[PDB]
Amino acid sequence: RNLLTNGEGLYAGQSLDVEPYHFIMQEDCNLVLYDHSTSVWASNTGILGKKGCKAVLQSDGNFVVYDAEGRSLWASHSVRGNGNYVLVLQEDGNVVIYGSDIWSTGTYK
């Protein structure tokens, strides 16, 4: 997987992968982007033993990490209002959240 749409997220251990790039929600609750085994970016929210966290792209365009409970720990704070958004791990090493839908075929089944 390389992207997340409204309501989708990464549970502890889950990740997006493209080439040697890896964006993962770890069992220490740290959200990290790796090039091979080298860490490149992180939410700096890790704590050994803090398992069960979840990262989720929401309807408001906000990407949030929650704990085993449902308490927030980190967020891009990119709330822009209800709509359709997507988070993508790009081939250029960048992780991006995109505006809202501007066009579609409308062929959802």
Among 37, 38, 44, 105, binds a copy of itself (CB under 8 A): 105
Closest distance between a copy of itself and the C-beta of residue 11, in Å? 18
Among 32, 53, 57, 65, binds ligand MAN (CB under 6 A): 32
Cα of 55 vs its chain's centroid, Å: 5
| 37 binding ligand MAN? (CB under 6 A) | no
State the residue for tokens 């967020």.
Answer: 75
SS (H, E, C) 11-69: ECCCEEEECCEEEEECCCCCEEEEECCEEEEECCCCCCCCCCCEEEECCCCCEEEECCC
| 99 binding a copy of itself? (CB under 8 A) | yes
| 65 binding a copy of itself? (CB under 8 A) | no
> Sign of the C-alpha dihedral, residues 41, 58, 99, 11?
positive
Residue closer to a copy of itself, measured from CB, 40 or 52: 40
- Secondary structure (3-state) at 86: strand
Whole-number Å distance between alpha carbons of 75 and 19: 26
Closest distance between a copy of itself and the C-beta of residue 8, in Å? 10
| 36 binding a copy of itself? (CB under 8 A) | no
Binding site for ligand MAN (CB under 6 A): 5, 21, 26, 28, 30, 32-33, 35, 39-42, 46, 58, 60, 62, 64, 72, 75, 79, 84, 90, 92-94, 96, 101, 104, 108
